[PDB]
Design a protein around this nucleic acid. Structure first.
Lengths: 54, 124, 100, 146
RNA sequence: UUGUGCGCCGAUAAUGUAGCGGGGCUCAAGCACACCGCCGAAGCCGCGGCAGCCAACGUGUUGGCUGGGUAGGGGAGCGUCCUGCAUCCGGUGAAGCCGCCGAGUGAUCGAGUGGUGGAGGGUGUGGGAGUGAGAAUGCAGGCAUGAGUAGCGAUUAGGCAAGU
RNA sequence: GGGGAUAAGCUCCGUGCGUCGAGAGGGAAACAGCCCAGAUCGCCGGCUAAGGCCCCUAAGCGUGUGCUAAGUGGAAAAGGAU
RNA sequence: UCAAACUCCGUGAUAGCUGGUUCUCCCCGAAAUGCAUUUAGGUGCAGCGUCGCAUGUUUCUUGCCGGAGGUAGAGCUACUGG
RNA sequence: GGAGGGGAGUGAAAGAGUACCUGAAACCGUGCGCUUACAAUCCGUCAGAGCCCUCGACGUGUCGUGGGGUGAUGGCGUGCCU
């Protein structure tokens, strides 16, 4: 099926607003002394030094 | 001599688009839709200028009827009594008196009652 | 006290000092005009008899001659190609009431 | 120009109307007029300047003719064959308030302002109401003779 | 029994009240006959503005009628470009573009101004037009909706460690 | 008036008949052709036409004399009916 | 690509057919009828529009007067038919 | 990492940076003011509460021959062309 009509600005923007990215949650960690933010999923990996941290 | 059509069209396009500020959607951006909406808006304005007098008269009649019924008299009998008494105040100022100066409206109701015939249903 | 004054086929409720726009009158600015009265309300008692109204008049001074809002008329009918553009600026006078 | 109500101009009063032996149409018309605010000299169709109306003795309403057992109150759920019909008799014996509510609601504008005006009508099947704190003014349906 | 004013069965399809517009009305808000008011249009009147025809007297004022309108007929004008002639403006800032504040009965205007811009323009009177687009399933360029959607091209399959 | 089955929102003619076409405004709920009425522009003035005055909705739950019990009003026939 | 290939040229082929045709205001303002037609969706003339000139109420309405019908109605040993 | 950019300079101007005179519209953003989640909207028009901005006068906020922006709410309202 093909669209019968051109979508108005309001509907297009309203539906387009739902395509977004969520901000991951970060917790602190202490590696090599300096404190830096790492997601809690990678807390153990950071503590064992398995995550490259620029 | 070759003539380019830029300025002549841009003039009327600017006027039409400026006249269509505040409209919703394509009616405020694109010249063609704005021109159609301008036709409709000016026709509506012309009709509503004529209808506004009747609308305001209806509102004044409503206010006068409410105020008169507050004084135990119908609007039509009050109007007939006022016409008989010779008072020539129109409905606009009658409604203004009703809203702002109830004592004057009460006095006018009294004089209208005085001017009315004894038996309103008599064949006279 | 205030009174209802007839001018230009209409009636306006005015008192001393009010400024009211009125249909065009053949008077130079700064002059004075006398107008009939449709009703006088002074305090409580209301004057409504025709001859009492004839015995009284409202004197006002002409402030300036002005023009009303610009009115754009574009008559139109579909499937016809008929358009008729027209404009109109009603002439007006500004009256300040001096007394009743 | 014509007077137009401002933010603080509107004032409301409470009217209580007894529905014992009253024709439903007459009572509903009076209540609709009161709710609309048509009785005030400062009426304006833009504003909701009406007055709060309380109706007691709803079960005692008067219905002429044979409308008690031959007038139906229809409602459709939207599903196929979802039409339900109840006569005024069972509606009064089951939900006495709903008859007067529907009668009054049918008599005022179906706008959004009508929906807002509906908020100012309270009806009760009993002879007493819990709104005594507002000290409602009794209202009698009278006719201004002309 | 005779005629009448109203009524009664006759009367009866398939989405949902559905054959008062709705609520509701016989405590008629129904019907018939009389009577009195009012609401009610861009109709008529009141005040003011414009125009066409005609009349009067004047050296353009007054007055009377008229002024919906497609096909179409006639009349009068706005804007653009190039030019003869005459004047005016411009690196102390033209055109062009974006605004504000206004103006005309209309096409429209602003030798009124603010910003940007950097080299040509205005006015009067004539001459000539490649002189005005909203649509031809119109042409060229740019960009939207569908939409961050379908798809990412077979029938074998990749994994780990190290390195760059 | 003809044709058709005097059936068609059928067709063909006549009408100093109307309207629409080329016609806005009010009414008939909506509703080219029905009814009132032909829009030069403005007004937050008045009187009315058709149509209406219980609420939606402006104006009469108007006055007087009677009828209606069928929601007749607010669809229809032969015929039937203390 | 085939009930007569493709390219250029005649060529800007021709279509009673279809679509499109751009700024404004003022005054007036129709027709969908008749005749003819290889004719019916086209066209010619006539009728109705507008502009100019000429002519003046000749136009129009009402009253009165002078006229011819063979309709409606009615009628029939007044005729012809049923 | 580059691309690109911020300082510093040249230039009368970098709102002239070899993507470069002037830089419109469509289209896409960012910031601020008003409004919007009980509502049936040819999306406008006429009334219109509230909020914000601005021009004057008088006091300390309140009107006015004011002007603007957005507009809850009510009435009306069947896109353009052929």
């Amino acid at each position: 099926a093909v669209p019968k009509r051109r979508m108005s600005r309001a509907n297009t923007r309203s539906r387009r607003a739902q395509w977004k990215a969520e901000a991951p949650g970060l917790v602190t960690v202490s590696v090599a002394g300096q404190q830096r933010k790492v997601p809690r999923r990678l807390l153990k990996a950071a503590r064992l030094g398995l995550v490259d941290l620029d | 001599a070759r003539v380019k059509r830029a300025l002549n069209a841009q003039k009327k396009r600017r006027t039409v688009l400026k006249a269509s500020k505040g409209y919703r959607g394509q009616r405020s951006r694109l010249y063609r839709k704005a021109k159609e909406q301008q036709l409709h808006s000016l026709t509506y304005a012309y009709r509503d200028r004529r209808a506004r007098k009747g609308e305001f008269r209806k509102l004044w009649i409503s206010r006068i009827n409410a105020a008169a019924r507050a004084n135990d008299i119908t609007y039509n009998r009050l109007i007939q009594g006022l016409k008989a008494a010779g008072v020539e105040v129109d409905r606009k100022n009658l409604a203004e008196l009703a809203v702002s100066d109830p004592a004057a409206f009460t006095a006018l109701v009294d004089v209208a009652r005085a001017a009315l015939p004894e038996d309103v249903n008599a064949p006279s | 006290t205030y009174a209802i004054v007839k001018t230009g086929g209409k009636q306006y409720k005015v008192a001393a000092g009010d400024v009211v726009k009125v249909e065009k009158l053949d008077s130079e600015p700064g002059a004075s005009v006398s107008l009939p009265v449709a009703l006088v309300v002074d305090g409580a008692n209301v004057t409504s008899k025709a001859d009492d109204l004839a015995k009284v008049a409202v004197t006002a001074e002409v402030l300036e001659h002005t023009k009303g809002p610009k009115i754009r008329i574009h008559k139109f009918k579909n499937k016809t190609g008929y358009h008729k553009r027209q404009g109109h600026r009603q002439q007006l006078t500004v009256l300040k009431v001096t007394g009743i | 120009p014509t007077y137009t109500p401002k933010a603080g101009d509107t004032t409301r009063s409470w009217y209580v109307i007894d529905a014992s032996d009253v024709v439903l149409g007459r009572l509903a018309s009076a209540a609709a007029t009161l709710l609309r605010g048509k009785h005030k000299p400062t009426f304006t169709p833009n504003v909701d300047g009406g007055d709060f109306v309380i109706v007691i003795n709803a079960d005692k309403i008067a219905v002429s003719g044979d409308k008690l057992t031959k007038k139906f109150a229809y409602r459709h759920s939207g599903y196929p064959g979802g039409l339900r019909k109840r006569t005024i008799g069972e509606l009064l014996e089951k939900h006495p308030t709903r008859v007067v509510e529907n009668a009054i609601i049918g008599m005022l504008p179906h706008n959004k302002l009508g929906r807002q005006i509906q908020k100012k009508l309270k009806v009760y099947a009993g002879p007493d109401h819990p709104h005594a704190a507002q000290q409602p003014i009794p209202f009698e349906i009278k006719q201004v003779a002309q």
